[PDB]
Amino acid sequence: GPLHMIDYKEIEVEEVVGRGAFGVVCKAKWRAKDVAIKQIESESERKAFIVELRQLSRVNHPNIVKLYGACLNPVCLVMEYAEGGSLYNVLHGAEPLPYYTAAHAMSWCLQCSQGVAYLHSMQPKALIHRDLKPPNLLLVAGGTVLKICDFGTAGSAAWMAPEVFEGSNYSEKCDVFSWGIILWEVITRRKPFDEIGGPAFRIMWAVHNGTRPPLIKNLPKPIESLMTRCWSKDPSQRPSMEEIVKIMTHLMRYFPGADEPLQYPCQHSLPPGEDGRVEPYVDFAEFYRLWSVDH
Numbered sequence: 690g691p692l693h694m695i696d697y698k699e700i701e702v703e704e705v706v707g708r709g710a711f712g713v714v715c716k717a718k719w720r721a722k723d724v725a726i727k728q729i730e731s732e733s734e735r736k737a738f739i740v741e742l743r744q745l746s747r748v749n750h751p752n753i754v755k756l757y758g759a760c761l762n763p764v765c766l767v768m769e770y771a772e773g774g775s776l777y778n779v780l781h782g783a784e785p786l787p788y789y790t791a792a793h794a795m796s797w798c799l800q801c802s803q804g805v806a807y808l809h810s811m812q813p814k815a816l817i818h819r820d821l822k823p824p825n826l827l828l829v830a831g832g833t834v835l836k837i838c839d840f841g842t843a844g845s846a847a848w849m850a851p852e853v854f855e856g857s858n859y860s861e862k863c864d865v866f867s868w869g870i871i872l873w874e875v876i877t878r879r880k881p882f883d884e885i886g887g888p889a890f891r892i893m894w895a896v897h898n899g900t901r902p903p904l905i906k907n908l909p910k911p912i913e914s915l916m917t918r919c920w921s922k923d924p925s926q927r928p929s930m931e932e933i934v935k936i937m938t939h940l941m942r943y944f945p946g947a948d949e950p951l952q953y954p955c956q957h958s959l960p961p962g963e964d965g966r967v968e969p970y971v972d973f974a975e976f977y978r979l980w981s982v983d984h
């Protein structure tokens with residue numbers, strides 16, 4: 690795909706917003722447009738920079754970040770600016786947190802899977818993201834449109850498939866595991882394996898033994914099936930991302946109002962930690978209503 694060579698004199702850096710998977714993201718202006726620039730900081734992030742630049746350029750999809758171009762002095766990428774911030778920040782970040790609905794949660798997960806499905810259909814070899822998690826998912830258009838960023842692989846223990854941290858023969862089915870966890874996360878508004886915590890290896894061990902995050906009380910069985918399939922030990926028993934996009938598209942019939950921008954605040958307090966099952970943040974009342982009207 691097309692790319693622009695950037696003169697750094699054409700960039701006016703406004704403020705530093707935070708760090709990506711590598712480097713530093715800064716809000717900027719270029720060609721009088723609102724951009725986000727990602728500067729390398731460690732010089733050891735050179736491999737990551739080359740990988741992201743290599744992938745983002747050939748990738749072209751509504752649910753993957755627009756790469757506008759690159760500047761080589763100093764070494765930085767010029768991408769689109771995400772107004773809403775990361776999905777992680779929307780779920781768990783700074784108070785006051787925005788209120789969101791089951792429709793949003795389902796819509797976000799559909800959009801995410803849409804991007805990943807595109808990546809998995811790349812020619813001649815599939816493109817695996819290898820790092821799917823809410824900090825690498827961005828929200829634009831008032832939090833109604835999701836974009837995948839941070840392709841530096843193409844603190845992640847909670848979203849990683851068991852075969853990945855085992856160094857084993859992993860395929861694109863590891864992305865499917867990640868998506869499974871993300872689905873659980875947006876439904877519950879809980880950090881996966883927050884209960885476990887510790888350092889990384891404590892989660893890795895838990896997941897490796899077959900620990901998955903707790904089941905959700907009152908969750909629809911078709912969503913529950915999809916979720917628990919996505920996080921099977923055997924990679925072959927997980928669905929394809931092509932199948933996930935189709936299933937999720939069809940469930941959106943029972944999730945209307947997904948295009949309503951995040952605007953209402955939320956004062957969020959959490960139920961007891963481990964009961965076996967957890968309460969969803971979102972309400973499935975309307976789902977069940979619209980379902981029984983059809984079925």
Ligand SMILES: CC(C)Oc1c(NC(=O)c2csc3c(=O)[nH]cnc23)cccc1C(=O)N1CCN(C)CC1
Pocket residue numbers: 706707708709710714725727754768769770771772773774775778824827838839
């Ligand atoms: C992850 C973070 C930087 O994400 C935000 C962004 N990010 C972007 O616009 C962005 C555009 S491209 C791109 C990328 O490739 N990686 C990470 N972020 C981006 C913007 C505003 C707030 C946030 C946001 O959650 N922080 C709020 C403030 N906190 C100190 C840091 C997190």
